[PDB]
Amino acid sequence: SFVILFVTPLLLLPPAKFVRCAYVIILMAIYWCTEVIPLAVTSLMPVLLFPLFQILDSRQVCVQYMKDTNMLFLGGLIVAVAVERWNLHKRIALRTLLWVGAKPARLMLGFMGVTALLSMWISNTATTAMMVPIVEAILQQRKRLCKAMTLCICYAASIGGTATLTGTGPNVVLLGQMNELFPDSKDLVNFASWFAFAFPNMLVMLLFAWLWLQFVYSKKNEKAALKVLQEEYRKLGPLSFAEINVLICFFLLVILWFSRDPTKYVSDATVAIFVATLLFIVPSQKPKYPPPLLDWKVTQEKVPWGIVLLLGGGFALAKGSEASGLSVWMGKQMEPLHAVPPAAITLILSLLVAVFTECTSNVATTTLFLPIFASMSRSIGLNPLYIMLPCTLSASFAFMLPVATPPNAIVFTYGHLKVADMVKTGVIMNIIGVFCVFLAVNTWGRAIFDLDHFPDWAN
Amino acid sequence: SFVILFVTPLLLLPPAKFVRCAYVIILMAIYWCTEVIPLAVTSLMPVLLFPLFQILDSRQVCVQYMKDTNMLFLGGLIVAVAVERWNLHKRIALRTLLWVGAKPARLMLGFMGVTALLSMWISNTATTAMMVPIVEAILQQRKRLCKAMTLCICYAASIGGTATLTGTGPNVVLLGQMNELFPDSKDLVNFASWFAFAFPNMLVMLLFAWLWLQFVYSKKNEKAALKVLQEEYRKLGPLSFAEINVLICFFLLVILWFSRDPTKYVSDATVAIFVATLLFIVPSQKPKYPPPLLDWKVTQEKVPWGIVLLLGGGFALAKGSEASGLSVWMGKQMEPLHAVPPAAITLILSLLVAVFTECTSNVATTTLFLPIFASMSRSIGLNPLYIMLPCTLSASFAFMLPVATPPNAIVFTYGHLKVADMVKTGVIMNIIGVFCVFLAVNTWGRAIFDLDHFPDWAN
């Protein structure tokens, strides 16, 4: 019940400041998992508790909630709001679905592919909420096929969100934790490098996921799917001037992100804010002044400020833990794990994170786990990325339960899925994702991020 | 037109870093006044421009957008959302209106008083939006009386918002500018001290405003007003458990604010966040688990995150100006004003700010003006509060034009008001407010804030 979770851990107070910080983290973790209070409200607990426990005064805690990574996430959110408002993502989805065809194998392949590619830029929740209605329309016009198609949308959304830093919350958590715990790693992880590392990983995950879904689960079926796609495309209207401007702004954002990383004042957040500002200036109609692509009302009602506060609370947790000496204590405690082969450590941690994300939020899960893993990596003399990147990717492997991530809840809202089918498919999804992420980290992740050597920024 | 304001100042680039910061500030000021892009989007321009002009890199700029004052404002906003959601503010308004009576003089007095007291805690926009419908209902059940009653609601809302730090945006701007420009002034300005200084000032403004409105502008009229108030009170329902809990949480917030100021880790933001968190825990119904007073959905859709970003942009402007050496340059330039008597300087500045707020947002106006006035005060060896407090109070004196502040727009949305009547009444409002604020700053503001001496935190 809520009462036992609300009251009992809060009254655990009877020590050292690192013990108080560990208590704050454990209480926040319990509130993350149990959802007794909202995620953003839980993320505000550092402001409440660190001054009370004298870890950081209110000024230090409050200045941790908006940062470079948080601003980059906000800019990406604004761009995503612009894309969703002018209905460009559905246009891309329908165009690519028409291009790939409608035969059931390639139909599922195209659905998973477009969901993954759109989830790189649009949020996984929004991508799933847009894509599932098309699946429902096609199915209405086999039970195994229905459940496979419902699962594939959320599975591909979760996989594709990992490909870009702004694609999913755990990636932004990883970037913020890298800047907090390892400040000397100046933009080593960025949009270009993270893309170069995760997009092939995302493609491998998508291919193996599609293969497994074909394993576990035709003319007029193709004709019905084509009819549905064409009818959905006709009501979309002609490619409008606003959609063209949004696409141009998005392409400019992508080009500036990938070109910035082929003193350094300009970062990825600067590019995101630049394009977001342009979205409030670029007209939505031909002048023949026409309204801009975005106004502050829709940006206000559509931006998930709760996730921004969640990221800020994660950064405040990192700051309080680093200042209070908790991270040093954890590193000293679990350095006797320097006897294990790093590969086995990565496999075990990825499996544990993938399992743990089935019960709680991906962003909260990676927020809780990344400081511990970074302390381990610093203690055992291993590259922090070599641990954090696979664990950050595994934080998005919410495949077993509908309550694991909002895309699973969205797909489970429809009646084609039961809990049992989802858990049987999701265990193999978790194993496949862990294997693919392991292979990527051990094969081309090493070249991109220099995982073979202990970096200087890890001390 | 928008095009000339969009393009021409942006292309002014052909110098010294302080010149570039001054250019950024001037461009932001033009965008504040002209409203070419939204206020929050304009507040994000430091992130775009300071890295481009090499004043501050993206990490320094982005960390300025959430701070102690911004968190306190957010907590107060959450508490206000809780009050508005459970319809407690309307209950207080109707109860006090029934208590004061319905005779036209005391009717207007009670309306102005309750609007001022509610605007201390609820936002001026929300207070006006709640209060004007009661006025309309009473009037429906003399043209001069109608226009007087419509003006008085927004006038009292603007006056009452000054009484508390969270009452209006300019006060939060003043607190943030005090922490930015004068870091050594540890919580010299706080909720308790600002209340002790401004609540008598607010009362004097309210009394003189009511007197002037009676100057420029009965049984069954009283009976109709009483009938309207009673009927509005009956549909409100009995005092519910949720309203009692919200009132208790509000009283706890007020008590903790006033008792904290009869190392220092706990601040007013800590109290605001504590009460806001309690609003997500305290039940809204008798357990007989019942839903809490707040959930994150309504808090998300009701909190003005745009104003939070506006405050953050103001803090980033202050940081970039202080770092770039612009403030030193302005102080050196306008120290030849050390020949004027401080009282004349305060009168002139208060008049200029009160006039300038008629054309642009109060928050933007005080954001633009406070750094210049602080630089003046530092240069001429005068207490910065002795200049900033009257100017911060005058920033809320939006009385002449409907476009000056959202309360004026709300009251002007109804047809009882024309622009001419509003400007004639508002010029005398501005003069009266400037005089009252001058008297308060020179009589009891000196005792509270030690305005007679140049403080050490002003260097």
B58, A179: Cβ pair inside 8 Å?
no
Separation in Å, CA of B290 to nearest CA in chain A: 10
Could you tell me if A52 lies within 8 Å of chain B, comparing CB atoms?
A: yes
Query: Could you give the angle at the alpha carbon of B48 between the alpha carbons of A248 and B404, nearest 5°?
Result: 100
CA gap A438, B400 in Å, rounded: 67
Residue type, position B63, single letter? V
Tallying the residues shown for chain B, one arrives at 459
Q: What separation in angstroms does the CA of A321 have from each of A39, A54, A119, A262, A325?
A: 19, 12, 32, 34, 6
CA gap A375, A322 in Å, rounded: 10
Count Cβ atoms within 10 A of the Cβ of residue B121 and give its class: 0-12 exposed, 13-18 middle, 19 or more buried.
Answer: buried
Gap positions in chain A, given as the residue before each gap (C–N > 2.5 A)? 14, 141, 217, 262, 288
Residue type, position A173, single letter? V
Which among B288, B409, B313 has a CA at the least distance from the CA of B358?
B409
CB A112 within 8 A of CB A308: no
Which of A6, A267, A305 shows the shortest C-beta gap to B300? A305
Could you tell me if A303 lies within 8 Å of chain B, comparing CB atoms?
A: yes
Which among A204, A52, A220, A457 has a CA at the least distance from the CA of B264?
A52
CA gap A382, A338 in Å, rounded: 9
Q: What separation in angstroms does the CA of B379 have from each of A133, B303, B325?
A: 65, 39, 14
Which of B44, B266, B276 shows the shortest C-beta gap to A51? B266
CB B375 within 8 A of CB B330: yes
Could you tell me if A301 lies within 8 Å of chain B, comparing CB atoms?
A: yes
Query: Could you give the angle at the alpha carbon of B439 between the alpha carbons of B437 and B445, nearest 5°?
Result: 80
**Chain A residues 338-397 with a CB less than 8 Å from chain B:** none
A52, B276: Cβ pair inside 8 Å?
no
**Three state DSSP letters for chain B:** CHHHHHHCHHHCCCCCHHHHHHHHHHHHHHHHHHCCCCHHHHHCHHHHHHHHCCCCCHHHHHCCCCCHHHHHHHHHHHHHHHHHHCCHHHHHHHHHHHHHCCCHHHHHHHHHHHHHHHHCCCCHHHHHHHHHHHHHHHHHCCHHHHHHHHHHHHHHHHHHCCCCCCCCHHHHHHHHHHHHHCCCCCCCCCHHHHHHHHHHHHHHHHHHHHHHHHHHCCHHHHHHHHHHHHHHHHCCCCCCHHHHHHHHHHHHHHHHHHHHCCCCCCCHHHHHHHHHHHHCCCECCCCCCCCECCCHHHHHHHCCHHHHHHHHHHHHHHHHHHHHCHHHHHHHHCCCCCCCCHHHHHHHHHHHHHHHCCCCCHHHHHHHHHHHHHHHHHHCCCCHHHHHHHHHHHCCCCCCCCCCCHHHHHHHHCCCCCHHHHHHHHHHHHHHHHHHHHHHHHHCHHHHHCCCCCCHHHC
Which among A244, A269, A235, A276 has a CA at the least distance from the CA of A81?
A276
Q: Which of B6, B52, B62 to mutate to test the interface with A (most CBs of A within 10 A)?
A: B62
Q: Which of B32, B48, B308 to mutate to test the interface with A (most CBs of A within 10 A)?
A: B48
Tallying the residues shown for chain A, one arrives at 459
Which residues from A are below 8 Å from B267, CB to CB? 51, 57-59
CA gap B369, B360 in Å, rounded: 12
CB A275 within 8 A of CB B44: no
**Three state DSSP letters for chain A:** CHHHHHHCHHHCCCCCHHHHHHHHHHHHHHHHHHCCCCHHHHHCHHHHHHHHCCCCCHHHHHCCCCCHHHHHHHHHHHHHHHHHHCCHHHHHHHHHHHHHCCCHHHHHHHHHHHHHHHHCCCCHHHHHHHHHHHHHHHHHCCHHHHHHHHHHHHHHHHHHCCCCCCCCHHHHHHHHHHHHHCCCCCCCCCHHHHHHHHHHHHHHHHHHHHHHHHHHCCHHHHHHHHHHHHHHHHCCCCCCHHHHHHHHHHHHHHHHHHHHCCCCCCCHHHHHHHHHHHHCCCECCCCCCCCECCCHHHHHHHCCHHHHHHHHHHHHHHHHHHHHCHHHHHHHHCCCCCCCCHHHHHHHHHHHHHHHCCCCCHHHHHHHHHHHHHHHHHHCCCCHHHHHHHHHHHCCCCCCCCCCCHHHHHHHHCCCCCHHHHHHHHHHHHHHHHHHHHHHHHHCHHHHHCCCCCCHHHC
**Chain A residues 249-268 with a CB less than 8 Å from chain B:** 263-267
Q: Tell me the resolution in Å.
A: 2.3
Separation in Å, CA of A15 to nearest CA in chain B: 18
Which among A347, A360, A357, A344 has a CA at the least distance from the CA of A437?
A347
A51, B265: Cβ pair inside 8 Å?
yes
Count Cβ atoms within 10 A of the Cβ of residue B252 and give its class: 0-12 exposed, 13-18 middle, 19 or more buried.
Answer: middle
Q: Which residues lie below 8 Å from residue A4, measured CB to CB, with a gap of 6+?
A: none
A349: phi then psi, degrees, rounded to nearest 5: -65, -40
Which residues from A are below 8 Å from B50, CB to CB? 265
Query: Could you give the angle at the alpha carbon of B9 between the alpha carbons of B5 and B15, nearest 5°?
Result: 170
Query: Could you give the angle at the alpha carbon of A154 between the alpha carbons of A153 and A158, nearest 5°?
Result: 120
Structure tokens at A259: 């070109």
Q: Which residues lie below 8 Å from residue B4, measured CB to CB, with a gap of 6+?
A: none
Residue type, position B62, single letter? C
CA gap B206, B249 in Å, rounded: 28
For the CA atoms of B289, B291, B292, B298, the dihedral, rounded to the nearest 10 degrees, stands at 160
Separation in Å, CA of B10 to nearest CA in chain A: 12
CA gap A303, B186 in Å, rounded: 34
Nearest CA in chain B to A283: B3
Could you tell me if A329 lies within 8 Å of chain B, comparing CB atoms?
A: no
Which among B92, B217, B202, B219 has a CA at the least distance from the CA of B155?
B202
User: Most distant CA pair in chain A: distance in Å?
Assistant: 72
Structure tokens at B456: 């050490």
For the CA atoms of A427, A433, A439, A440, the dihedral, rounded to the nearest 10 degrees, stands at -170
Is the four-CA dihedral A268, A271, A275, A280 of positive or negative sign? positive
Separation in Å, CA of A185 to nearest CA in chain B: 13
Q: Which residues lie below 8 Å from residue B156, measured CB to CB, with a gap of 6+?
A: B111, B112, B113, B115, B116, B119, B206, B209
Residue A237: count of CB within 10 angstroms of its CB: 10
Q: Which of B10, B70, B191, B265 to mutate to test the interface with A (most CBs of A within 10 A)?
A: B265
Residue type, position B112, single letter? M
Which among A309, A413, A359, A373 has a CA at the least distance from the CA of A47?
A309
CB A64 within 8 A of CB A50: no
Which residues from B are below 8 Å from A264, CB to CB? 57
Q: Which residues lie below 8 Å from residue A341, measured CB to CB, with a gap of 6+?
A: none
B131: phi then psi, degrees, rounded to nearest 5: -85, -35
Q: What separation in angstroms does the CA of B131 have from each of A345, B36, B126, B156?
A: 63, 31, 9, 11
Residue B180: count of CB within 10 angstroms of its CB: 22
CA A421 to chain CA centroid, Å, is: 24
Nearest CA in chain A to B1: A289
Interface A-B, measured as beta-carbon pairs within 8 A, has a size of: 156
CB A401 within 8 A of CB A359: yes
Structure tokens at A40: 């953003």
B94: phi then psi, degrees, rounded to nearest 5: -65, -40
Q: Which of A31, A184, A273, A315 to mutate to test the interface with B (most CBs of B within 10 A)?
A: A273
Structure tokens at B376: 């003046």
Q: What separation in angstroms does the CA of B173 have from each of A218, B72, B371?
A: 66, 12, 11
CA gap B411, B315 in Å, rounded: 31
Number of Cα atoms under 13 Å in the Cβ half of residue B71: 36
Which among A396, A453, A431 has a CA at the least distance from the CA of A124?
A396
Number of Cα atoms under 13 Å in the Cβ half of residue B80: 24
Nearest CA in chain B to A47: B270
Q: Which residues lie below 8 Å from residue B345, measured CB to CB, with a gap of 6+?
A: B337, B376, B382, B387
CA gap B300, B242 in Å, rounded: 20
CA gap A63, B319 in Å, rounded: 13
CB A85 within 8 A of CB A298: yes
Structure tokens at B213: 């409105």
Which residues from A are below 8 Å from B52, CB to CB? 265-266, 270
Which among B225, B179, B144 has a CA at the least distance from the CA of B73?
B179
Residue type, position A165, single letter? L
Which residues from A are below 8 Å from B41, CB to CB? 276-277, 280, 296
Instruction: Name the method of structure determination.
Output: cryo-EM
CA gap B152, B168 in Å, rounded: 18
A254-286: buried (b, 16+ CB within 10 Å) or exposed (e) per residue?
Answer: bebbeebbeeebbbbbbbbbbbbbbbbbbebee
